[PDB]
Amino acid sequence: TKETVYISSIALLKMLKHGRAGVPMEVMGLMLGEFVDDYTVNVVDVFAMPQSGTGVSVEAVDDVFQAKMMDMLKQTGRDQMVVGWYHSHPGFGCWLSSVDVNTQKSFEQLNSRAVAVVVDPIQSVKGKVVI
């Protein structure tokens, strides 16, 4: 319940950069990390899904490119667990989508557990973070 998420600020900013520009869209894509015992949400990395002209969806996820990367990442030595989901939710404290949930919910399946990262890239820019 008190659960420990851990981010590569790289991945954080990477998302931000992706997310900051992502407005309007919720940015989408992998979340690279793991779970060290319980509670522990590690993030080394993340990345954009490429633009979804279908917008954020359980569908718009393409695991092709990840593997492509993930390979090249594996080639890079870059490897993690995909730990969840991070999107850019303009003016959204609220919640992302039950879709996004279902989206994740379909996906956190692939883990013990995952995340859907709320971001308001709008409200992020404030000099403090919104997430």
Binding site: M25, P50, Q51, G53, G55, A60
Partner: protein
Amino acid sequence: MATLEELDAQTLPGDDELDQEILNLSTQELQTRAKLLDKNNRQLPYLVANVVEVVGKAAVVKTSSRQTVFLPMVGLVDPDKLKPNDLVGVNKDSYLILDTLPSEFDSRVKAMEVDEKPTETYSDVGGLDKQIEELVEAIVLPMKRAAPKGALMYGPPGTGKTLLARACAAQTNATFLKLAAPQLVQMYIGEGAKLVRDAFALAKEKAPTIIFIDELDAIGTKRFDSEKSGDREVQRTMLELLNQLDGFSSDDRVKVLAATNRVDVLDPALLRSGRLDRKIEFPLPSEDSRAQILQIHSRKMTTDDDINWQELARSTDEFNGAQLKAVTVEAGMIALRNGQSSVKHEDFVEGISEVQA
């Protein structure tokens, strides 16, 4: 002699490369072609928007939600398709124009009424073959050779001014447009102008066109003076068409044909090559010109041949055709009211007898 054989047989794989190499190159974007575009496309529908700039790559549009956005002119769109007053598939969230949107559920002003090139002859209302020539002289001949953009009707309809228009609309095979001046007189500034503007384009879309104005004198009023605030419309809507008439000459596709019982104002505009050229009468036709119509009316009734048109035609007087038919349909009616399926002179004289004034 067999060397270039091998040599160019050795080129072939090196030749084969490029295309094969490209067949590799092909798929690559072909996806990202599809992928994005696919991703991308489309919603039903978008909010559309109207361009301003088309530097050379630059466009701003303002949404059907009324929102001005710049964008580098997007991919699915073309600088010519790109234009103000436009339908555009536009990612609303992104304000990225997705698609151009074409002539579409775009307002035809449902109020406006289009009759496309209705097949009609000059045997509609008989005895009018007089200016039926002037029609051909002002419409058909200008159309089929290389000229006015239309003629000014006048004279009472029911003589089938519209029919002769629609006759010309079949004859020239030009798009007939009868748009009610009732639609053109507006509470909105230059809206009939806009209506005339739409009709201008929309019928010119269907040009060759015969634009048939109903009682031009509705919008045929510029008054005399500086009071135009009260009615700009009847003036300005007229002024709209005039400049659309003043906007072409050699287009004989467009035939603007203005029907009145008689037109009110007369301008060298109103009779002009490139504007309404030809002021054309359609008075209530002569007696056996009407017997010719009464023919067309007494035509399709089953009849006993008591009918004598000229007696009818002289006893009836100056009917716009349908009053003969009023006589006639009465006659047919009166034929059963005379018990006959046959429709006779008496039927028609009783078609006269029901008061013809």
